[PDB]
């Protein structure tokens, strides 16, 4: 139906190309928590070429023209758009299967999130080299919603502990229950063929 | 004045090496300017005494 990608620990370009192909193949993909997407090169380097991006400004009226987005959701959304044929109506419809969310909204906070090990910083960068966070190059460039998001993450993650705390309550119980066996006639055929 | 303290101020203000290209204020046993703008060059002169 729809896949949900957690975005932290991933690279900017390695994730957004895989989103750009999976969204051309008919799926509905939703990338959540695109605040902590890493991007290679140190922070002062990547903050330069975003400031160079901001002055690409049409001279005669900047109102029409290049729309510099600053939230790291639409930074990630604009990266996918440059890897799509958005001037065609097949490339328009590809963007409508992408819905990107910064932070974690309540339709998407209780789903299970997937990661892409192609795009992870742990996978793909050599560990002795420097990387930039997309959250604080957005915060350095006009994104005025870092504090109101990082408040709502710890309100979100505190509610997620008390779920997981009581989940491992539940599976301590059904593991203590399956000690009370009474069923080893059925345990023959699963251990025989990979329980 | 206090000539024991007069030497201690000159340790931070006069006893240094100046580069002819980056113009930096380096340290008295430099061989190269640390600043990248000259390409870490190796022509240094002592800071001129009064």
């Amino acid at each position: 139906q729809v896949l949900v990608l957690d975005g932290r620990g991933h690279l900017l370009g390695r994730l957004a190309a895989i989103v750009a192909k999976q969204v051309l193949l008919g799926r509905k993909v939703v990338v959540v928590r695109c605040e902590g997407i890493n991007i290679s090169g140190n922070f002062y380097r990547n903050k330069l070429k975003y400031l160079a991006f901001l002055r690409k400004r049409m001279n005669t009226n900047p109102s029409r023209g290049p729309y510099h987005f600053r939230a790291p959701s639409r930074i990630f959304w604009r990266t996918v758009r440059g890897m799509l044929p958005h001037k065609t109506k097949r490339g328009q419809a590809a963007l409508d299967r992408l819905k990107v969310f910064d932070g974690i909204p309540p339709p998407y906070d209780k789903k299970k999130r997937m990661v892409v090990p192609a795009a992870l910083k742990v996978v793909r960068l050599k560990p002795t080299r420097k990387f930039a966070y997309l959250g604080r190059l957005a915060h350095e460039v006009g994104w005025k919603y870092q504090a109101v998001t990082a408040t709502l993450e710890e309100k979100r993650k505190e509610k997620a502990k008390i779920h997981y705390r009581k989940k491992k309550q539940l599976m301590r119980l059904r593991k203590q229950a399956e000690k009370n066996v009474e069923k080893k006639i059925d345990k023959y055929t699963e251990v025989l063929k990979t329980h | 004045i206090e000539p024991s303290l007069r030497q201690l101020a000159q340790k931070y203000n006069c006893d240094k090496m100046i580069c002819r290209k980056c113009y930096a204020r380096l340290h008295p046993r430099a061989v190269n300017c640390r600043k990248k703008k000259c390409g870490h060059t190796n022509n240094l002169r002592p800071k001129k005494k009064v």
Partner: protein, 191 residues
């Protein structure tokens, strides 16, 4: 080159006990405790053996700028060992021309209020890094003493004073005025 490992060790005396959570190191000693995280530096640490307490930092894989940081690790532990038993004391002295420097402490040995520097009206209030102590000397003219456990909180705070007494728009080779550091010592002596 990618050499097989290098390793320095750091011996630990008895009153200090180093425990490590990971690449984070917790150093408890007599005169307090302090901790440093090295989660950027890609090396393993190993304290080995009861009753002798040896810390073994070694890097198995690596290049020449990755080999240079294995000594920087062990030389930061020995500033945590020395500073948690002896402490650090950076005595610094005021050098002045015609105008005497008036230096006082406002807030509990943390804020430093410098006035009459070079005859100027502008006070210069220096708030320090948390963990040092301000103290004007006794049995010495115009000497200021900073004391604490951690060297980088002592030394950076001793740099804020010397940087604040900076003569501007003048010849800096005459006009030798400033509160310069003069001695790098310990709080407890000779241990």
């Amino acid at each position: 080159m990618k050499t097989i490992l290098s390793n320095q060790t750091v011996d630990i005396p008895e009153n200090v006990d180093i425990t490590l959570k990971g690449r984070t190191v917790i150093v408890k000693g007599p005169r307090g405790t302090l901790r440093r995280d090295f989660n950027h530096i890609n090396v393993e640490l190993s304290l080995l053996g009861k009753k002798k307490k040896r810390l073994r930092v070694d890097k198995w894989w690596g290049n020449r700028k990755e080999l240079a940081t294995v000594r920087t690790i062990c030389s930061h532990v020995q500033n945590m060992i020395k500073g948690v038993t002896l402490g650090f004391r950076y005595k610094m002295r005021s050098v002045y021309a015609h105008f005497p420097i008036n230096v006082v402490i406002q807030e509990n040995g943390s804020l430093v209020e410098i006035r009459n520097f070079l005859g100027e009206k502008y006070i210069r209030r220096v708030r320090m890094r948390p963990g040092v102590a301000c103290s004007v000397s006794q049995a010495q003219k115009d000497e200021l003493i900073l004391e604490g456990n951690d060297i980088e909180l002592v030394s950076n705070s001793a740099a804020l004073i010397q940087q604040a007494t900076t003569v501007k728009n003048k010849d800096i080779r005459k006009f030798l005025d400033g509160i310069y550091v003069s001695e790098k010592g310990t709080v407890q002596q000779a241990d």
